[PDB]
Amino acid sequence: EADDGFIVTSNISPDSQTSDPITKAVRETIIQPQKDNLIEQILKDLAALTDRDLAEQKRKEIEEEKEKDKTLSTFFGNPANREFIDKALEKPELKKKLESIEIAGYKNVHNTFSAASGYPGGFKPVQWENHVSASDLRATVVKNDAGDELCTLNETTVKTKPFTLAKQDGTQVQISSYREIDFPIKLDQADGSMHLSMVALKADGTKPSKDKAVYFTAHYEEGPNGKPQLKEISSPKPLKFAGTGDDAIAYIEHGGEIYTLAVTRGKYKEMMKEVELNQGQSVDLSQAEDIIIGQGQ
């Protein structure tokens, strides 16, 4: 059974001038390969375009940009590429590739930086404490090396709002329980860095096995003022949202099963905004999807 994980700290290298080894590992194993497989799919899709002038223009744009910036920041921020991105993201052959690199990617990150593997201050299971009076809440006080609180994370489990969603093949799945974590955007407590790995939950709110586990990750590095600064996030892609509102829970189809992530649409958009302001590499790659709220279908 997979678990939530955390780290707290207070030419080729593990880190970079602007990032720590965890953030760098997540960019190298998750963020950049997701983009690379996606671009490969877009390039293949361009061969099936009847408009050869457009296919050739788009190909040259992708190739020229890749040579200047491998992170393709301009490509992904250009609304004219949205239809190409969206059409590639609906290909099951791409989805299959993303899934295997995500499972292997998260496993390699957790195994490389695990405290169990011998990495000092490495990933350890999150120690959630059940709320004393609220049955739907758990909390964890994230403390630095000196024992000072960086933040406290609030986990809300929703067990009384069932809804049905659909897999890409039309199969209906009822979500009978999910959770959401109130990830901080800006921190103003103790100094330091913090990395969070929150496991995806199955439709009934239980944890998947270690072999099938995917995560929502959040990367906070010590900023200029000493406070943790949100630099990066990651998740399996494309990310879906159960509904259109800010309260819509993130979900994914992975290995033919549905999982929810501990982030709502409103929280995801706030985190995406902070990541971009802090020059992160994360790209949105998400879509709000239709759902039926209640006990029906």
Tab-separated table of C-alpha atoms in Angstrom:
chain	number	residue	atom	x	y	z
A	1	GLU	CA	0.000	0.000	0.000
A	2	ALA	CA	1.386	3.416	-1.104
A	3	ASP	CA	1.638	6.351	1.288
A	4	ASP	CA	1.885	10.147	1.423
A	5	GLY	CA	5.505	11.348	1.637
A	6	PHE	CA	7.317	14.540	2.706
A	7	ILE	CA	10.781	16.126	2.941
A	8	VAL	CA	11.678	19.128	5.118
A	9	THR	CA	15.114	20.859	5.034
A	10	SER	CA	16.345	24.048	6.834
A	11	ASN	CA	27.866	20.496	-15.977
A	12	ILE	CA	25.698	17.564	-14.601
A	13	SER	CA	24.579	17.970	-10.929
A	14	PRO	CA	21.772	16.791	-8.533
A	15	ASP	CA	20.587	20.461	-8.258
A	16	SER	CA	20.841	23.690	-10.313
A	17	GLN	CA	21.474	27.414	-9.605
A	18	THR	CA	17.680	27.975	-9.188
A	19	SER	CA	16.510	24.564	-7.812
A	20	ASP	CA	17.128	21.824	-5.233
A	21	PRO	CA	17.640	18.048	-6.074
A	22	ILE	CA	13.967	17.078	-5.464
A	23	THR	CA	12.496	19.809	-7.728
A	24	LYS	CA	15.152	18.976	-10.372
A	25	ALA	CA	14.388	15.173	-10.157
A	26	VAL	CA	10.625	15.817	-10.565
A	27	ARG	CA	11.292	18.076	-13.647
A	28	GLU	CA	13.616	15.416	-15.149
A	29	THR	CA	11.451	12.347	-14.472
A	30	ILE	CA	7.890	13.713	-14.637
A	31	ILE	CA	7.420	17.263	-16.062
A	32	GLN	CA	9.919	17.192	-19.001
A	33	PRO	CA	9.129	13.551	-20.132
A	34	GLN	CA	5.357	14.309	-20.101
A	35	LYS	CA	6.082	17.296	-22.410
A	36	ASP	CA	8.477	15.171	-24.548
A	37	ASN	CA	5.994	12.320	-25.138
A	38	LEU	CA	3.256	14.945	-25.809
A	39	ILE	CA	5.414	16.786	-28.413
A	40	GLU	CA	6.257	13.421	-30.101
A	41	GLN	CA	2.480	12.727	-30.356
A	42	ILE	CA	1.816	16.259	-31.770
A	43	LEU	CA	4.624	15.692	-34.375
A	44	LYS	CA	3.021	12.345	-35.354
A	45	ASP	CA	-0.467	13.980	-35.532
A	46	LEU	CA	0.959	16.682	-37.895
A	47	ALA	CA	1.627	13.908	-40.499
A	48	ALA	CA	-2.173	13.177	-40.563
A	49	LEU	CA	-3.084	16.846	-41.284
A	50	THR	CA	-4.561	17.357	-44.788
A	51	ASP	CA	-3.261	20.968	-44.666
A	52	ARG	CA	0.447	20.278	-45.424
A	53	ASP	CA	1.353	24.008	-45.328
A	54	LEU	CA	0.040	24.182	-41.718
A	55	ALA	CA	1.634	20.769	-40.788
A	56	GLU	CA	5.061	21.983	-42.040
A	57	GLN	CA	4.748	25.434	-40.414
A	58	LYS	CA	3.791	23.919	-37.023
A	59	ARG	CA	6.628	21.319	-37.250
A	60	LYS	CA	9.251	24.066	-37.938
A	61	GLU	CA	7.845	26.145	-34.984
A	62	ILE	CA	8.171	23.141	-32.588
A	63	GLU	CA	11.704	22.226	-33.837
A	64	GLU	CA	12.982	25.829	-33.681
A	65	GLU	CA	11.617	26.360	-30.177
A	66	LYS	CA	13.002	22.981	-28.872
A	67	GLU	CA	16.532	24.198	-29.900
A	68	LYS	CA	16.148	27.450	-27.890
A	69	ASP	CA	14.151	26.158	-24.878
A	70	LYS	CA	13.677	22.408	-24.189
A	71	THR	CA	10.987	23.338	-21.532
A	72	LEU	CA	8.901	24.822	-24.481
A	73	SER	CA	7.553	27.627	-22.286
A	74	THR	CA	6.427	29.745	-25.334
A	75	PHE	CA	4.853	26.697	-27.091
A	76	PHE	CA	2.707	25.723	-24.042
A	77	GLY	CA	1.747	29.326	-23.237
A	78	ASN	CA	0.529	29.971	-26.821
A	79	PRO	CA	-3.312	29.591	-27.122
A	80	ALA	CA	-2.876	28.749	-30.868
A	81	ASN	CA	-1.319	25.369	-29.770
A	82	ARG	CA	-4.267	24.342	-27.554
A	83	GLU	CA	-6.114	22.366	-30.286
A	84	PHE	CA	-2.875	20.477	-31.221
A	85	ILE	CA	-2.192	19.776	-27.501
A	86	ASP	CA	-5.840	18.677	-26.882
A	87	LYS	CA	-5.962	16.375	-29.935
A	88	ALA	CA	-2.659	14.677	-28.919
A	89	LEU	CA	-3.828	14.274	-25.249
A	90	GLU	CA	-6.914	12.251	-26.339
A	91	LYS	CA	-4.711	9.565	-28.005
A	92	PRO	CA	-4.730	6.307	-25.934
A	93	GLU	CA	-1.205	5.489	-27.297
A	94	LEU	CA	0.121	8.728	-25.692
A	95	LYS	CA	-1.866	8.086	-22.458
A	96	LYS	CA	-0.254	4.594	-22.189
A	97	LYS	CA	3.267	6.201	-22.493
A	98	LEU	CA	2.486	8.924	-19.909
A	99	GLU	CA	1.181	6.302	-17.466
A	100	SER	CA	4.305	4.079	-17.554
A	101	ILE	CA	6.708	7.041	-17.200
A	102	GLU	CA	4.571	8.470	-14.342
A	103	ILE	CA	4.551	5.207	-12.297
A	104	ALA	CA	8.314	4.626	-12.930
A	105	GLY	CA	9.057	8.356	-12.456
A	106	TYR	CA	7.376	8.640	-9.025
A	107	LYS	CA	8.971	5.314	-7.901
A	108	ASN	CA	12.447	6.518	-8.956
A	109	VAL	CA	12.028	9.901	-7.201
A	110	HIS	CA	10.767	8.288	-3.961
A	111	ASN	CA	13.473	5.555	-4.094
A	112	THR	CA	16.342	8.045	-4.867
A	113	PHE	CA	15.400	10.496	-2.062
A	114	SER	CA	13.812	8.086	0.468
A	115	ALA	CA	15.039	8.261	4.107
A	116	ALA	CA	14.720	4.400	3.983
A	117	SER	CA	17.216	4.421	1.021
A	118	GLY	CA	19.610	6.354	3.256
A	119	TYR	CA	19.038	9.905	1.976
A	120	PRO	CA	19.464	12.214	5.056
A	121	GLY	CA	16.239	14.163	5.655
A	122	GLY	CA	14.706	12.047	2.874
A	123	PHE	CA	11.064	11.150	2.089
A	124	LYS	CA	9.227	9.703	5.068
A	125	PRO	CA	5.489	8.826	5.368
A	126	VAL	CA	3.322	11.855	6.302
A	127	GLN	CA	2.214	11.557	9.952
A	128	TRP	CA	-1.478	12.578	9.705
A	129	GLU	CA	-3.251	13.098	13.027
A	130	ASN	CA	-7.019	12.599	13.161
A	131	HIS	CA	-8.894	15.744	14.259
A	132	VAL	CA	-10.132	15.637	17.874
A	133	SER	CA	-13.743	16.803	17.084
A	134	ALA	CA	-14.167	16.892	13.253
A	135	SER	CA	-14.541	13.336	11.814
A	136	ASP	CA	-13.740	14.474	8.198
A	137	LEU	CA	-10.407	16.154	9.125
A	138	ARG	CA	-6.770	15.196	9.603
A	139	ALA	CA	-3.837	17.556	10.000
A	140	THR	CA	-0.041	17.400	9.969
A	141	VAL	CA	2.346	19.991	11.445
A	142	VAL	CA	5.302	20.238	9.033
A	143	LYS	CA	8.385	21.125	11.134
A	144	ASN	CA	11.977	22.037	10.107
A	145	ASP	CA	15.294	20.645	11.544
A	146	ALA	CA	15.104	23.188	14.452
A	147	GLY	CA	11.549	21.974	15.278
A	148	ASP	CA	9.796	25.164	14.061
A	149	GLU	CA	6.544	24.877	12.078
A	150	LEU	CA	6.872	25.610	8.305
A	151	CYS	CA	3.052	25.085	7.961
A	152	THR	CA	0.234	22.759	9.062
A	153	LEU	CA	-1.516	20.806	6.283
A	154	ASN	CA	-5.295	20.297	6.495
A	155	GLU	CA	-6.778	17.178	4.845
A	156	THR	CA	-10.598	17.235	4.360
A	157	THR	CA	-12.189	13.882	3.481
A	158	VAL	CA	-15.566	14.208	1.658
A	159	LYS	CA	-17.730	11.090	2.322
A	160	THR	CA	-21.211	12.654	1.950
A	161	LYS	CA	-21.135	14.076	-1.591
A	162	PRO	CA	-21.242	11.056	-4.012
A	163	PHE	CA	-20.968	11.754	-7.742
A	164	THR	CA	-20.526	9.773	-10.961
A	165	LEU	CA	-17.936	10.469	-13.656
A	166	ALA	CA	-17.177	8.715	-16.945
A	167	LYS	CA	-13.996	7.025	-18.204
A	168	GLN	CA	-12.836	7.970	-21.772
A	169	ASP	CA	-14.667	4.797	-23.029
A	170	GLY	CA	-17.977	5.988	-21.440
A	171	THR	CA	-17.933	3.561	-18.426
A	172	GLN	CA	-19.622	5.239	-15.367
A	173	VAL	CA	-17.700	5.227	-12.047
A	174	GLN	CA	-19.146	6.368	-8.712
A	175	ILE	CA	-16.756	8.310	-6.440
A	176	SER	CA	-18.031	7.551	-2.936
A	177	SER	CA	-15.142	9.304	-1.107
A	178	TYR	CA	-12.282	11.697	-1.917
A	179	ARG	CA	-9.990	14.110	-0.070
A	180	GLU	CA	-8.642	17.589	-0.616
A	181	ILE	CA	-5.539	19.137	0.932
A	182	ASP	CA	-5.360	22.877	1.560
A	183	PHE	CA	-1.839	23.329	0.076
A	184	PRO	CA	-0.286	26.702	1.096
A	185	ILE	CA	0.450	29.215	-1.717
A	186	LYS	CA	2.562	31.673	0.280
A	187	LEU	CA	4.170	30.709	3.591
A	188	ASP	CA	5.014	33.161	6.396
A	189	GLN	CA	6.118	30.857	9.269
A	190	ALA	CA	9.515	29.039	9.784
A	191	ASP	CA	12.339	29.133	7.208
A	192	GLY	CA	13.164	26.193	4.929
A	193	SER	CA	12.166	23.920	2.036
A	194	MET	CA	9.382	21.347	1.842
A	195	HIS	CA	8.413	18.676	-0.712
A	196	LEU	CA	5.058	16.913	-0.590
A	197	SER	CA	3.916	13.720	-2.335
A	198	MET	CA	0.192	12.991	-1.882
A	199	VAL	CA	-0.999	9.646	-3.231
A	200	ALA	CA	-4.032	9.355	-5.570
A	201	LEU	CA	-7.082	7.684	-3.980
A	202	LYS	CA	-9.279	4.985	-5.537
A	203	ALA	CA	-13.061	5.654	-6.180
A	204	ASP	CA	-13.941	4.337	-2.645
A	205	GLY	CA	-11.343	6.623	-0.997
A	206	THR	CA	-8.742	3.890	-0.282
A	207	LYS	CA	-5.022	4.034	-1.191
A	208	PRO	CA	-3.775	2.101	-4.267
A	209	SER	CA	-0.914	-0.411	-4.132
A	210	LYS	CA	2.712	0.896	-4.429
A	211	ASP	CA	2.933	-0.651	-7.965
A	212	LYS	CA	-0.046	1.363	-9.361
A	213	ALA	CA	0.444	4.542	-7.263
A	214	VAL	CA	0.591	8.026	-8.783
A	215	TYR	CA	0.846	11.309	-6.851
A	216	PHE	CA	0.158	15.015	-6.720
A	217	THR	CA	3.477	16.644	-5.729
A	218	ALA	CA	4.280	20.177	-4.496
A	219	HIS	CA	7.798	21.675	-4.266
A	220	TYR	CA	8.596	24.561	-1.946
A	221	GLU	CA	12.150	25.883	-1.818
A	222	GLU	CA	13.681	28.390	0.607
A	223	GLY	CA	13.035	31.814	-0.961
A	224	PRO	CA	15.039	35.088	-0.602
A	225	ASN	CA	13.264	35.938	2.730
A	226	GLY	CA	13.975	32.370	4.025
A	227	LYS	CA	10.331	31.289	3.662
A	228	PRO	CA	9.319	28.200	1.563
A	229	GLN	CA	8.349	29.375	-1.937
A	230	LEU	CA	6.164	27.246	-4.264
A	231	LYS	CA	8.447	26.493	-7.264
A	232	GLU	CA	6.835	23.460	-8.844
A	233	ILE	CA	3.992	20.970	-8.813
A	234	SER	CA	3.396	17.724	-10.718
A	235	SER	CA	0.712	15.139	-11.345
A	236	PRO	CA	-0.228	12.428	-13.869
A	237	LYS	CA	-1.371	14.082	-17.159
A	238	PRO	CA	-3.808	15.043	-18.675
A	239	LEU	CA	-5.413	16.072	-15.358
A	240	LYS	CA	-9.257	16.073	-15.200
A	241	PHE	CA	-11.603	17.958	-12.824
A	242	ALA	CA	-14.905	16.519	-11.641
A	243	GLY	CA	-17.091	19.518	-12.619
A	244	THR	CA	-16.476	23.196	-13.635
A	245	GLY	CA	-16.416	24.965	-10.249
A	246	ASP	CA	-13.462	25.792	-7.993
A	247	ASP	CA	-14.486	22.908	-5.671
A	248	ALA	CA	-14.236	20.330	-8.541
A	249	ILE	CA	-11.840	17.539	-7.420
A	250	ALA	CA	-8.877	16.539	-9.620
A	251	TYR	CA	-9.120	13.044	-11.078
A	252	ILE	CA	-7.266	10.793	-13.519
A	253	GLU	CA	-7.857	7.550	-15.368
A	254	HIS	CA	-4.687	5.433	-14.858
A	255	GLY	CA	-4.217	1.782	-15.828
A	256	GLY	CA	-7.938	1.666	-16.681
A	257	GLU	CA	-8.964	2.802	-13.133
A	258	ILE	CA	-10.211	6.137	-11.776
A	259	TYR	CA	-8.358	7.943	-8.997
A	260	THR	CA	-8.886	11.370	-7.446
A	261	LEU	CA	-6.013	13.655	-6.416
A	262	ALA	CA	-6.027	15.795	-3.190
A	263	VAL	CA	-6.354	19.097	-5.063
A	264	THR	CA	-9.447	21.015	-6.172
A	265	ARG	CA	-9.635	23.068	-9.390
A	266	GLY	CA	-9.471	26.370	-7.479
A	267	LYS	CA	-6.418	25.216	-5.495
A	268	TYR	CA	-4.750	23.806	-8.660
A	269	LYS	CA	-5.242	27.147	-10.534
A	270	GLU	CA	-3.827	29.127	-7.522
A	271	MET	CA	-0.776	26.750	-7.354
A	272	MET	CA	-0.314	26.876	-11.159
A	273	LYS	CA	-0.365	30.735	-10.946
A	274	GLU	CA	2.298	30.832	-8.112
A	275	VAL	CA	4.507	28.199	-9.905
A	276	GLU	CA	4.456	30.338	-13.133
A	277	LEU	CA	5.266	33.574	-11.196
A	278	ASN	CA	8.250	31.666	-9.635
A	279	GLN	CA	9.480	30.586	-13.132
A	280	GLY	CA	8.410	26.945	-12.763
A	281	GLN	CA	8.232	24.507	-15.670
A	282	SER	CA	4.771	23.045	-14.957
A	283	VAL	CA	2.259	23.382	-17.770
A	284	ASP	CA	-1.507	23.236	-17.100
A	285	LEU	CA	-2.565	20.209	-19.297
A	286	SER	CA	-5.994	19.923	-17.566
A	287	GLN	CA	-9.678	19.763	-18.528
A	288	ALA	CA	-12.896	20.214	-16.529
A	289	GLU	CA	-15.202	17.259	-17.254
A	290	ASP	CA	-18.897	16.557	-16.842
A	291	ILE	CA	-20.251	14.786	-13.729
A	292	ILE	CA	-23.571	13.722	-12.136
A	293	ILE	CA	-23.820	14.844	-8.509
A	294	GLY	CA	-25.937	12.605	-6.262
A	295	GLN	CA	-26.637	8.913	-6.001
A	296	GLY	CA	-27.703	8.536	-9.667
A	297	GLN	CA	-25.920	6.689	-12.540
